[PDB]
Amino acid sequence: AVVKCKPTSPGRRHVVKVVNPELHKGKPFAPLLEKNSKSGGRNNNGRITTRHIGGGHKQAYRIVDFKRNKDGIPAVVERLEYDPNRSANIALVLYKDGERRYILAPKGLKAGDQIQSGVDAAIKPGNTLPMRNIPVGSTVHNVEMKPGKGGQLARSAGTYVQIVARDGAYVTLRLRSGEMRKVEADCRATLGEVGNAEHMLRVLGKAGAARWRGVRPTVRGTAMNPVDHPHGGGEGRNFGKHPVTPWGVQTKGKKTRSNKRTDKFIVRRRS
Amino acid sequence: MKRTFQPSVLKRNRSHGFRARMATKNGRQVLARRRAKGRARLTVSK
RNA sequence: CGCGGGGUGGAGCAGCCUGGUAGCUCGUCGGGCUCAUAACCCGAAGGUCGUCGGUUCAAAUCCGGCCCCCGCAACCA
RNA sequence: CUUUAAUGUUUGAUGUUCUAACGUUGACCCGUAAUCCGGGUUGCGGACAGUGUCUGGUGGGUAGUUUGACUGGGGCGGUC
RNA sequence: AAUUCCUUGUCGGGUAAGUUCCGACCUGCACGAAUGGCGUAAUGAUGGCCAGGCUGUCUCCACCCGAGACUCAGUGAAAUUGAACUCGCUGUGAAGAUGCAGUGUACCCGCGGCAAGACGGAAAGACCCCGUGAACCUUUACUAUAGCUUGACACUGAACA
RNA sequence: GCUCGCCGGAAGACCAAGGGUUCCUGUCCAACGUUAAUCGGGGCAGGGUGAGUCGACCCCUAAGGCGAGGCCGAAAGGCGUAGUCGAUGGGAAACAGGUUAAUAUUCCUGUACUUGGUGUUACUGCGAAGGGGGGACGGAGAAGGCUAUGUUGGCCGGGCGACGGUUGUCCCGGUUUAAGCGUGUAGGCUGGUUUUCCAGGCAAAUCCGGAAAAUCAAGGCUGAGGCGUGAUGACGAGGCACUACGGUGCUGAAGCAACAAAUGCCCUGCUUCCAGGAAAAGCCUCUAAGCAUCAGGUAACAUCAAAUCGUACCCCAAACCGACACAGGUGGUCAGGUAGAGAAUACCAAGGCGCUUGAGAGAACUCGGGUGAAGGAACUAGGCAAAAUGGUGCCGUAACUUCGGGAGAAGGCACGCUGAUAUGUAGGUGAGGUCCCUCGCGGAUGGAGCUGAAAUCAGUCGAAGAUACCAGCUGGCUGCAACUGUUUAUUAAAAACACAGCACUGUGCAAACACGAAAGUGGACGUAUACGGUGUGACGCCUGCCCGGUGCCGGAAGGUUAAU
RNA sequence: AGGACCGAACCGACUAAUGUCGAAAAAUUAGCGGAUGACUUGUGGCUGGGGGUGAAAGGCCAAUCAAACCGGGAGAUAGCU
RNA sequence: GCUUGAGUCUCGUAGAGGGGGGUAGAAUUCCAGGUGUAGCGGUGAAAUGCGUAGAGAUCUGGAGGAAUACCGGUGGCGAAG
């Protein structure tokens, strides 16, 4: 449910909340938890390698495996929950064999129903199986790169990977950003688009909704000193140069693609 | 105001203690000249 | 106070640079097309090349005076 | 000499295939209760990638410096 | 106009009086639509102006009460300082004289004060220039370089089209 | 020693930190103290710190450090696994009274509690670096029940009082009690129990998880305080007795009711919302490799051990940091009476002090202020400084607007005391009596006592009734910035920065980017509704023309073109 | 519920005076800003000199910053005083 | 109360009435490849543009979006659009 609180004060005036009672109004499953140290963007040499990270409320590490190798085992979706670790709601699935597993929750999935894994599955919103059983033109998510790897793409809210063709051993895919890339047809994925799709319409409104998240302000380089950034100085608030990064790299247009070993897999680029 | 010295034997001795100097190559190097000068406070301790 | 460029038919520009022969569009006068004007087509005229002097085969051209125009100046405590 | 044609022969640029080099922050086992790592099966790519030597380009991200003098003070200007 | 040089532009309003202010006329030296333009509720230890309220700020201060200043006893510094029998004026002069000359004046020496001078004390002027000084920053100043990137060679092979 | 004044959410009483005998006693005055000094934190000599229950060490972890092998790098060295360390974290257990010149939850008396070892008796199967549960948790808000504590009264003791009253509705003092045990309420949570089966928990499993049956409705867990006990005990006002005149010995009445009520407790609760809120061990329990005339475990009992270190004093300051006996800074706990909403503030209780230069003088001038005629900003860069508005309930409240606000807008009225309605109301709390009962810390009922707003009417006092401390100046136009916030600490707090939003662009994961000669990491154990660079800066209406120069990207045929 | 309102402890330092060899090598006093939050703060760690950090001032890094400090190059050089 | 108003039930009829979810076909564009070549496109004419880096044309494959030729008719449905 999307809503904007009445202006009792500017700040609480521009908040957009996404609430849904489908969600578990309690605590996470304790017997499937492991701690998580917030790094603060520091390396082993303690230097803050990346900016915009600091503070953030105590996010613990909820275990979410992605391999889905519980084959030939029907399961029951017990309850639905939210996790700040991801941006889409999580599904707490209860197995027939007395097992539990935190996995991604699709759109049309309501707690209490039935989902599964295995090579005896059907085309259902939540079943995980190899792509070699999946029909042409399917809207899949949580797809992998190498079979058994677990999960690589489409893990954010309201996402989906479009599978086009299945010629030979390679499967023609369509990435969200428009990058038709190849994969081995035997990767295990789950059918359906990622739920909690109304997450995108949520807009902070306040600086707090950035700091207690973990975000640390982006200070404009032109406002900085000439000595500590490629920008800075000039008593008239002027740019007068070629827009670059804090480290000499030309921004606003510069292909930083270079690995050379995945070019074979990269077929159609993002144009 | 407040002067820049709020002492703490734990904080001091953990960075300037005997083991703190003998921890690194450099600490043993510095202690060489200290033993040469023979200053009683080789390492500020008891 | 200085520096750079320009000054050419009624208007705006050529040609100058690298010296012999002065051009284009519009305009003016007139004729025609329509009942009339305009537009359009054609012909001719219209330039002491701001002014004077010097000099080399000529002076629009090269150079030296004077006048006029644009931009920057009226600056450091 | 030029235009051309079959062939022997000598090198090169691409297309494709393969597996042994190699890569492997794919799955799994053992060392071992150990997300490091090594080796062992396998799967997936592929003589690519990456690194070294040479070399062209780009390049204030980084470094070492130059940036004239006379001048009725400097600067502008002018001149040498 | 946080922008308008000229200039206190012009007109109307506020005032007896308006280089500022408010609203407009556009002659924009030289506003400008993400180096965002124009408005804007709420908000502001913010910039400017006006009014009412209230008052010593002012016209012009007056008195009184405390902590010092003044006296006494004890304790006892200070920056600074070439040397002193250390007056004014006129003039001259390394060019504004306490010290030279002319001339006037002035008993010797303290206390409380006040601040014109001794170009008074503190800071080997932070301004200008100079030094073939330094220091960082800048870029289409000169020369290298990190990194990025290209190709040949090596690791690097075996078959056909 | 008798008075005065001062703070009293402190200038008080206890700890950590950090100092290091500054604590106490005797004695002394040259030197330390900005004065004198038989005084003291100064000199000299002596004494004092007593622990199974406090803290720490210890056990087990976090940020993170070290880190056998290993990866990597001229060397030095860097990162990191297993492990090993490291609290501000968690984990067993004590309180009261008295005593000293100085120390006592440590000594003594009284009364309790905890973890282990050996031994004894009677039973019973036990046993991991492995699994499970627990441990174990967020912010704010409101409510019920109590406590610390305080007040009135009752009772006991004493006095009845140096200027008028004062045997009475008078005055003052006391009225204190823990840990633990037993009971186990208020309150909160959850359906228990029994049978069977299972690709699950690296293996196993009776422990847990799951799916079907069955029986019956509670069982269990947890839990401040009250009440008994602890305790015919301790203590306790005042007397009774000797002075080294400092104090000690002895004795000992009352010892409760009621009301108000914490930020303390149940609460490591509950509701709700979002930014979604450690870990390991101790403990309980199931078992593997196995061992069962054993070894061990459970329970009762006896006895023994509980080591080492700190323990003085200061601890919001003359004892810490500031060179000083320095108007400053330094965390946490406790924190009474009256007024007051309140930990503000003012005056007192407890307790501790008057600040380690005083005495005369009362001039100019300087500083902290009081008051001020007529006037009311004429001052000045400027309403800066001062003055003043200043409280509660209620009335009333514009332009504008994003329809929240603006706003406590502006601008006004009533305020003290007494009696009455009513020998102090509404309200709150609530014993005895009565009835019942699945009998206990019970449920209804019943109403004494106690405590205590406010409204109205009438009367009266003064010039003034929020009378004091305390405690907004307001109205309007307008520039800019959105607004909270941040910054040049030691002259600039703003229009600057940040800001949520928005746009472009880079990135397909061994991701870009970044530190690091490398490995490895952050990014992220996230992956395009994600993350990085940059610009602008809420919202509202919108955001035009130019690809010449430069930069970037795409296309590469051709010209030029290094090494080879 | 609120980066909500008023106002103390708390954190800060807008205005004026005192002070400037002071009480103090930036404080006191009387008024103020925020004060359930981008909050304050204790204890305990990591990031470091051409690098760290930065709600961005060329401020901060032990009273010292357009490049801290200790030793050593070095008795550096000085057409200057 | 009755019934020629109106409404309802029993059985059938016609339909671009509306909403939601799938799908088919030709054509147009783009991307890649094979063949091939100086024009292509356009107009009253010419030109900008596209093209020798090899277009258009042509064959094949693929990815997508919008509208539904002929049936179609002053035919049909609806209150109107």
Side-chain angles (χ1 to χ4, degrees), chain A:
Chain A
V2 290
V3 73
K4 172 175 60 181
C5 302
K6 288 175 66 66
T8 176
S9 75
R12 164 51 58 174
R13 167 195 271 283
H14 271 289
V15 73
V16 170
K17 296 188 295 185
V18 281
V19 200
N20 214 322
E22 293 280 315
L23 190 153
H24 170 64
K25 307 311 298 172
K27 331 299 170 178
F29 187 64
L32 196 61
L33 286 177
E34 176 59 62
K35 69 167 299 301
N36 165 260
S37 54
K38 195 57 178 181
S39 53
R42 307 303 149 71
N43 65 319
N44 308 313
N45 278 154
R47 298 195 177 189
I48 178 173
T49 64
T50 312
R51 293 182 303 190
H52 323 306
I53 175 62
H57 209 283
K58 226 155 302 177
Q59 290 158 42
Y61 196 63
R62 262 68 70 185
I63 311 169
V64 181
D65 203 66
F66 285 96
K67 308 181 186 303
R68 293 294 300 282
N69 39 31
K70 301 294 294 302
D71 317 306
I73 305 169
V76 179
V77 287
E78 179 177 303
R79 60 193 209 180
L80 321 172
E81 59 289 323
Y82 199 90
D83 189 355
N85 203 191
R86 258 66 56 182
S87 299
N89 68 322
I90 317 301
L92 189 54
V93 188
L94 200 68
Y95 286 104
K96 164 63 183 180
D97 66 83
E99 273 190 55
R100 301 188 187 69
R101 179 166 299 182
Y102 272 110
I103 48 175
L104 196 159
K107 178 184 182 180
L109 176 68
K110 295 305 187 181
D113 300 316
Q114 191 168 303
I115 64 172
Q116 57 177 42
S117 298
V119 203
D120 197 24
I123 314 300
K124 303 169 60 64
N127 287 176
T128 304
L129 61 165
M131 299 184 292
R132 70 199 314 180
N133 292 77
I134 307 178
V136 174
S138 301
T139 60
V140 205
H141 78 289
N142 190 20
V143 71
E144 300 170 39
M145 259 307 289
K146 282 180 173 295
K149 176 61 172 299
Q152 299 269 283
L153 322 178
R155 298 198 308 150
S156 81
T159 323
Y160 77 93
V161 183
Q162 183 48 260
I163 292 183
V164 180
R166 194 170 55 191
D167 300 311
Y170 281 90
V171 180
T172 314
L173 319 176
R174 166 189 280 185
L175 281 174
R176 183 84 182 192
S177 59
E179 199 157 312
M180 307 288 174
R181 228 206 63 272
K182 281 187 171 183
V183 293
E184 169 49 87
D186 300 1
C187 281
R188 296 176 176 178
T190 311
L191 297 168
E193 278 189 38
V194 182
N196 204 303
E198 57 203 331
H199 150 71
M200 175 174 60
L201 305 178
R202 170 188 68 91
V203 284
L204 316 178
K206 300 179 58 190
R211 302 319 311 295
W212 53 54
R213 290 279 196 290
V215 179
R216 191 179 165 75
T218 59
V219 186
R220 294 171 295 126
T222 55
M224 307 186 157
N225 289 304
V227 72
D228 53 32
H229 192 285
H231 300 164
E235 299 192 314
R237 304 208 73 199
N238 294 292
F239 206 73
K241 298 174 298 303
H242 303 290
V244 297
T245 56
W247 305 284
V249 186
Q250 160 79 48
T251 180
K252 270 199 174 185
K254 166 66 180 188
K255 296 183 175 60
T256 66
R257 155 61 200 182
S258 292
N259 281 315
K260 283 297 298 298
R261 66 191 191 73
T262 58
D263 309 329
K264 157 209 170 305
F265 295 99
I266 296 183
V267 187
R268 275 87 178 87
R269 292 300 312 181
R270 172 204 70 272
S271 185

Side-chain angles (χ1 to χ4, degrees), chain B:
Chain B
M1 46 177 227
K2 161 179 57 181
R3 185 52 174 164
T4 67
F5 195 44
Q6 297 160 300
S8 178
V9 308
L10 186 55
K11 197 147 176 50
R12 177 188 188 69
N13 297 40
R14 274 177 173 177
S15 71
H16 307 313
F18 189 72
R19 279 180 56 73
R21 292 297 174 182
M22 293 296 278
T24 176
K25 161 70 64 181
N26 307 290
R28 293 211 277 274
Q29 190 202 328
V30 180
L31 276 170
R33 306 189 312 294
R34 280 297 268 287
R35 266 195 157 87
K37 292 158 64 175
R39 198 189 285 290
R41 271 107 176 77
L42 300 83
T43 57
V44 50
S45 172
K46 198 187 74 61

